[PDB]
Amino acid sequence: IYKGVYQFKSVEFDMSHLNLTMPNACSANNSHHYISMGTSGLELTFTNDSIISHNFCNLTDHTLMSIVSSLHLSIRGNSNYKAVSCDFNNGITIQYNLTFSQSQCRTFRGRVLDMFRTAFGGKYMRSCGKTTWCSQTSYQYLIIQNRTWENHCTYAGPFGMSRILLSQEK
């Protein structure tokens, strides 16, 4: 109660129903992240082990391919053409190599963390005495695969995907 007349109360929103029409972007924990649109899902795992060693891939359902292309185009600058491995057969599996070939931002790790950052927010993998701009990471791999959504995290909403859409090709 406040001023003896009005009552203080809060609202809590559920984003589970905002699924068939809107994308959802979240993280289960420090390791795993998820992007779910309808019944389709993409799992972004920060493994410290690699599973693919092609180091060469040709970019040549549509929903997950459009989400992946938005995420990839939202890494800005040059991807060095030798730090991405692809497997578009029998599923979508893209591995980023995320390793050094004190700025810590001018590298490919800095920009890949910047894109992960800008898609998923800065609650995890963030620093913060002056702290560098780009986020900090102790892993050396980033694997984006397809996973059939099973309500792994709490639904967040399309806000991260909107931030990705705005910050594209800048």
Binding site: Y6, F8, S10, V11, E12, F13, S66, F159, R163, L166
Partner: protein, 147 residues
């Protein structure tokens, strides 16, 4: 401005059912100084799309990408991002708080519940904002009573 008014059971996660008056929906007519209006626009778009179109993931994603600016306030989203960036309490679009009249149900526009360090702000941190909103709402109420 409704494409299909107050919330229902499945939209509220905590309580069984609560919803607002006509002043909030009448004020959220292209209002982009507040996040609750964007949430209402998103919920309204989802409700109107589910009741008129068959389920389709690709087409829904296409229509969202085309009309993303029509629903989510871009600058509010980027300011809340910037607040999250610098170790500042920001809005993560989950919890909203407001004040309502005890009897006539005169509700205000729900302000976002700021979150920092993975935890909601305490009620004592933004009590000044609550007092200011109570004051301006009571002034608006007395002005409406006068007319």
């Amino acid at each position: 401005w409704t494409l299909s008014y107050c919330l229902t059971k499945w939209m509220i996660l905590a309580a069984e059912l609560k919803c607002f008056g006509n002043t909030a929906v009448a004020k959220c007519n292209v209002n982009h100084d507040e996040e609750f209006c964007d949430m209402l626009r998103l919920i309204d778009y989802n409700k109107a799309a589910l009741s008129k179109f068959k389920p389709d993931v690709e087409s829904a994603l296409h229509l969202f990408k085309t009309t993303v600016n029509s629903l989510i306030s871009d600058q509010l989203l980027m300011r809340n991002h910037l607040r999250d960036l610098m170790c500042v309490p920001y809005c993560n679009y989950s919890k909203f708080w407001y004040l309502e009249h005890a009897k006539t149900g005169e509700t205000s526009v729900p302000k976002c519940w700021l979150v920092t360090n993975g935890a909601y702000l305490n009620e004592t941190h933004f009590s000044d904002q609550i007092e200011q909103e109570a004051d301006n709402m009571i002034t608006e109420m007395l002005r409406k009573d006068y007319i």
